[PDB]
């Protein structure tokens, strides 16, 4: 496996240079902020970028307070049925009859 270990290393190495432990440029970064701070465009940048990446969310999640943890969306319909109020039994009486008549 000598030829294998050589290949795996070179790609491990290449991935790490893509990471940025530092700043790239400052004029771009400052000009990037002044444009958005001019009118309050920052919030859109935070919301949208935070959605399709977690790493930026993890950094900013700490500044936030009063978090909420809804269920996961796929497990939401099941979550509502289990928490059926007494009023929802009114539905389930009908939805029980609608199928019995079929069967």
């Amino acid at each position: 496996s000598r030829s294998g270990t050589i290949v795996k290393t070179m790609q491990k190495i290449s991935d790490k240079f893509k990471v940025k432990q530092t700043v790239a440029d400052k004029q771009k970064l400052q000009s990037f902020l002044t444009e958005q701070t001019r009118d309050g465009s920052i919030k859109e940048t935070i919301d949208v970028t935070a959605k399709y990446d977690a790493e930026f969310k993890t950094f900013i999640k700490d500044y936030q307070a009063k978090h909420k943890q809804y269920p996961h969306i796929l497990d939401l319909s099941h979550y509502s049925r289990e928490n059926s109020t007494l009023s929802k039994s009114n539905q389930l009486r009908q939805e029980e009859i609608d199928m019995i008549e079929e069967f």
Partner: peptide, 22 residues
């Protein structure tokens, strides 16, 4: 609601994130 990026499990409030004095 059938699109994930529009709907999270622990959603943000950018206004809080801004309005923190830090």
């Amino acid at each position: 609601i059938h699109k994930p990026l529009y709907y999270m499990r622990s959603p943000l409030d950018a206004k809080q994130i801004v309005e923190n004095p830090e």
